[PDB]
Design a protein around this ligand. Structure first.
Ligand SMILES: [Zn+2]
Ligand SMILES: [Zn+2]
Ligand SMILES: [Zn+2]
Ligand SMILES: [Zn+2]
Ligand SMILES: [Zn+2]
Length: 92
C-alpha cells in the first residue's frame, strides 16, 4: 500500500490492536473480497483478543491500497467509527 496509508496504520497501531474484536470486521472484508478465508483462519487461531487483532493488523500491513480501504470500511460498518476516523486521512 501507499506509504501514507502504511504510516497511518503504524501511527495508530497500538490503539487499533487494543480495541478491535476481529470476527465481524473479518467477515466484512471477506464479503468485500479483500481478506481470504485462509488469512481469517490464521487470525482466528490466536488465543486472545489482542493477539487476534495483532495478527490481523500484521496481515493488513502487507496488503494493498484496496485492502486498506476495505479494512477502513469494515471499521466504519462494524462498530469502530472512532478508529476509522484515525485512518481517514491515510486513505490511499
Ligand atoms: Zn469468516
Ligand atoms: Zn460489515
Ligand atoms: Zn464493505
Ligand atoms: Zn488452522
Ligand atoms: Zn501490537
Amino acid at each position: 500500500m501507499d506509504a501514507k496509508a502504511r504510516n497511518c496504520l503504524l501511527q495508530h497501531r497500538e490503539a487499533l490492536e487494543k480495541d478491535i474484536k476481529t470476527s465481524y470486521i473479518m467477515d466484512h472484508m471477506i464479503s468485500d473480497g479483500f481478506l481470504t478465508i485462509s488469512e481469517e483462519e490464521k487470525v482466528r487461531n490466536e488465543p486472545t483478543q489482542q493477539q487476534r487483532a495483532a495478527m490481523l493488523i500484521k496481515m493488513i500491513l502487507k496488503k494493498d491500497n484496496d485492502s486498506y480501504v476495505s479494512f477502513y470500511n469494515a471499521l466504519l460498518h462494524e462498530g469502530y467509527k472512532d478508529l476509522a476516523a484515525l485512518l481517514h486521512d491515510g486513505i490511499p
